[PDB]
Design an enzyme around this catalytic site. Structure first.
Site, PDB file in Angstrom:
ATOM      1  N   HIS B  40       0.903  -1.086   0.121  1.00 28.45           N
ATOM      2  CA  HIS B  40      -0.137  -0.103   0.064  1.00 28.45           C
ATOM      3  C   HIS B  40       0.756   1.285   0.046  1.00 28.45           C
ATOM      4  O   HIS B  40       0.431   2.444   0.010  1.00 28.45           O
ATOM      5  CB  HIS B  40      -0.936   0.135   1.108  1.00 28.45           C
ATOM      6  CG  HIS B  40      -0.386   0.265   2.606  1.00 28.45           C
ATOM      7  ND1 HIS B  40       0.021  -0.523   3.566  1.00 28.45           N
ATOM      8  CD2 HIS B  40      -0.247   1.654   3.082  1.00 28.45           C
ATOM      9  CE1 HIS B  40       0.353   0.155   4.565  1.00 28.45           C
ATOM     10  NE2 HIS B  40       0.257   1.548   4.357  1.00 28.45           N
ATOM     11  N   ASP B  84       0.486  -7.543   1.902  1.00 25.12           N
ATOM     12  CA  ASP B  84       0.867  -6.196   1.949  1.00 25.12           C
ATOM     13  C   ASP B  84       2.303  -5.989   1.866  1.00 25.12           C
ATOM     14  O   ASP B  84       3.127  -5.912   3.007  1.00 25.12           O
ATOM     15  CB  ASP B  84       0.175  -5.146   2.890  1.00 25.12           C
ATOM     16  CG  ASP B  84       0.300  -3.937   2.902  1.00 25.12           C
ATOM     17  OD1 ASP B  84       0.638  -3.326   1.892  1.00 25.12           O
ATOM     18  OD2 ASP B  84      -0.185  -3.217   3.790  1.00 25.12           O
ATOM     19  N   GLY B 175       2.369   6.612   8.183  1.00 23.33           N
ATOM     20  CA  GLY B 175       3.510   7.317   8.170  1.00 23.33           C
ATOM     21  C   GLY B 175       4.645   6.093   8.570  1.00 23.33           C
ATOM     22  O   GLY B 175       5.720   6.280   8.185  1.00 23.33           O
ATOM     23  N   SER B 177       3.868   3.269   8.048  1.00 18.38           N
ATOM     24  CA  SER B 177       3.601   2.246   6.998  1.00 18.38           C
ATOM     25  C   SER B 177       4.667   1.934   6.101  1.00 18.38           C
ATOM     26  O   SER B 177       5.531   2.591   5.601  1.00 18.38           O
ATOM     27  CB  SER B 177       2.430   2.828   6.183  1.00 18.38           C
ATOM     28  OG  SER B 177       1.417   3.000   7.206  1.00 18.38           O
ATOM     29  N   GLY B 178       4.742   0.625   6.089  1.00 15.30           N
ATOM     30  CA  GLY B 178       6.028   0.179   5.294  1.00 15.30           C
ATOM     31  C   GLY B 178       7.281  -0.180   6.136  1.00 15.30           C
ATOM     32  O   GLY B 178       8.024  -0.986   5.576  1.00 15.30           O
TER      33      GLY B 178
END
Lengths: 223, 223
Positions: B40, B84, B175, B177-178
């Site tokens: 994402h 993801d 933020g 995220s990943g």
């Protein structure tokens, strides 16, 4: 907007989205060439988008214009967000019509107890973030200054007003910043700050626009 | 990171910031040319920033490299965020050194009860948003799958793991995220989603990386 409802399409015709490649703040169109927003939304290049309902789909009513002059209030204080108001002159006038129209500046400061409308494409959650596509609307009253000052001991100036619900659940949020609170047809506040979003006892605080009408007018005239 | 602490400068040397003109996600450097992040976080042009501590001040250890290939897992499902995970090949290898180093892929799936480190420049508040300048760190355990599934009835796949505290107060947030959750020196999870940030009974859920080691290896090799 947390706890709000989707505005009827183009029913808030003075609402604009300030975009830098993404929507980052809202504002209000006050005549065919000038927009009022929050001084903390300042960026050196801004594209103003008018006529928007779905911020992500071209629906056919948008006008996108670049800001030519972006003027922050000379006493804007970055640390307290006192005088958080900014004026943006568009690089050319827009076509005013059903879905793109002006909102009036205040003839007086609205009393506590007035119902207002706040709108924007800002964060819709009280925890985490979710940005909406469609413009959100919220009906909310202007709160007594004593309630405002009680919620934020030592931070409210005479230039700030609280709007919202002390029980929480409904409020504006980051991304609504710079946009409008209109009460009985006049721009009475600009979304400015609050602790969290929609929390109990932490109402949003707004720049009190009826304190700046002379400045807004001086500035449009000198520019 | 909500409820975390500022990481010692360059003590998380595999952490990278994915930037499109602004930091929007984190990731982990797994060799001198490849980064793993969340599917994402996909954007068609990404600048990967390594060696960062203060995301806003040039401190002198940064290396900024453009992504050349950005590969999302072929079964990434945008609606459930299942699978993801994404791989980014940098357009040139980076200079590995004290403040820029690799993190190991897992030799097995970590057990519930393992303490992990999560880091990132993501949102630090459980209500509203505040983006930090300095990298934040959080020590947090991997939770039992039954606790994970109980918090999110019907949404946890075998490819998702919860990490955090069921009492809330400390969690990763938008933020982050990943970015990485590393337990005993190996990348065990990737920040993926959760309801809110740091809420009671709503732990964060992470992509379970020990399910993808063959894919990560196939893909680096075929590319």
């Amino acid at each position: 907007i947390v706890g709000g409802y989707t505005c009827q399409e183009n029913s808030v015709p003075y609402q604009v989205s300030l975009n830098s490649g993404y929507h980052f703040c809202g504002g209000s169109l006050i005549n065919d060439q000038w927009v009022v927003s929050a001084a903390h939304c300042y960026k050196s290049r801004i594209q103003v988008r008018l006529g928007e309902h779905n911020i992500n789909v071209l629906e056919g009513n948008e006008q996108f214009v670049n800001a030519a002059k972006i003027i922050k209030h000379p006493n804007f204080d970055r640390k307290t967000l006192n005088n958080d108001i900014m004026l943006i002159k568009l690089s050319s006038p827009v076509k005013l019509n059903a879905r793109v129209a002006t909102v009036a500046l205040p003839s007086s400061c609205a009393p506590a107890g007035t119902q207002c409308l706040i709108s924007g494409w800002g964060n819709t959650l009280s925890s985490g973030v979710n940005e909406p596509d469609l413009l959100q609307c919220l009906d909310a009253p202007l709160l007594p200054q004593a309630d405002c000052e009680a919620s934020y001991p030592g931070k409210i100036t005479d230039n700030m007003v609280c709007v919202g619900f002390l029980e929480g659940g409904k409020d504006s949020c980051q991304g609504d910043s710079g946009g409008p609170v209109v009460c009985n047809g006049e721009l009475q506040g600009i979304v400015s700050w609050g602790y969290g979003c929609a929390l109990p006892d932490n109402p949003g605080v707004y720049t009190k626009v009826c304190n700046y009408v002379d400045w807004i007018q001086d500035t449009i005239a000198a520019n």
